Amino acid sequence: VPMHPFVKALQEHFTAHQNPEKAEPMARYMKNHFLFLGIQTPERRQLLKDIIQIHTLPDQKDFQIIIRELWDLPEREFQAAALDIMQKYKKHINETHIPFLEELIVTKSWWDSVDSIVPTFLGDIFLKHPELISAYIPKWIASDNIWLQRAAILFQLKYKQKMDEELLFWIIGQLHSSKEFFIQKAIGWVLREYAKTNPDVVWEYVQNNELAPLSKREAIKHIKQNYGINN
DNA sequence: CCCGAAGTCCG
DNA sequence: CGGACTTTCGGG
Ligand SMILES: Cn1cnc(N)c2ncnc1-2
Question: Is the CB of A185 under 7 A from strand B?
């Protein structure tokens, strides 16, 4: 079965505007885990727009198919395009898509893809269906996969006043001993972000609970100005 | 335009 | 460790 024509068209159009000179530092930035075509985000978005203008966005029945086919292509720009495309089908995504989103998190995994999947798409789903959190988060925490663990930490990143504090701190407590950089940093990030909403609770937490030095330092990067640094 | 959010380099 | 800096991106 041939590649979906929309994907084939995107592949052709991206490839015609590839930039090998730019591709080398872009690939190095991601620790050479991926090939790159060398197309940065402003141009990449315009080339996608070009293809939508000519071909129109595929019927929703092909949504998951399109995403998978782009996910399977070697160059990283195709996963970036896939996430742009998924945003265009946002109003069709619901709680039944959690396993589909899971599979995206654990394939071609790195911080760029996982950070674009988790606080937005998964975050919105669990905000609407908080009863489903306990069907997934304990498995993610227990998994060997650091990107599922990072997802458990970051899905609440944008919740602000809707943050489930008890849940957040329980998750962090489960992962605080991790020696993985991307876990320590994710803990630091979610705490720093939540501190913008509730600085007192974050300050109390970091002063009275074990964290990696990296996590604590990232957590209080801003609020240490409000509380001061004791001699 | 502005600010806030991985990577290298060096002490 | 972790500060000083890098370029890119999201969002205002
Ligand atoms: C991706 N990226 C680029 N530049 C910075 N200064 C950053 N801080 C966090 N993430 C960053």
Answer: yes
The pairs formed by A8-12 with CB atoms below 8 angstroms and a separation of 24 or more are A9/A51, A9/A54, A9/A55, A10/A47, A10/A48, A10/A51, A10/A70, A10/A78, A10/A81, A11/A73, A11/A78
Domain that holds residue A157: 1-231
What's the CA dihedral at A174, A176, A177, A179 to 10 degrees? 120
| Residue A226 CA, ligand 1 centroid: distance in Å | 24
User: In the complex, which nucleotide's C1' lies nearest to the CA atom of residue A182?
Assistant: B6
Nearest-CA neighbor of A114 among A30, A193, A52? A30
Is A141:A175 a contact under the CB 8 Å cutoff? yes
> How many angstroms separate the CA atoms of A206 and A20, rounded?
45
> The domain spanning residue A172 has which CATH number?
1.25.10.90
- Whether A217 CB is under 7 Å from strand B: no
Which residue, chain included where needed, has tokens 């071609």? A108
Alpha carbon of A156 to ligand 1 centroid (Å): 20
In whole angstroms, B7 C1' to A125 CA is: 32
Distance A111 CA to ligand 1 centre (A): 12
Distance (Å, whole) CA A49 – CA A85: 10
C-alpha to C-alpha distances, A125 to A5, A107, A118, A141, A170, nearest whole angstrom: 30, 20, 10, 18, 20
- Total domain count for chain A? 1
Residue–nucleotide distance: A32 CA to B11 C1' (Å): 28
A31 touches strand B (CB under 7 A): yes
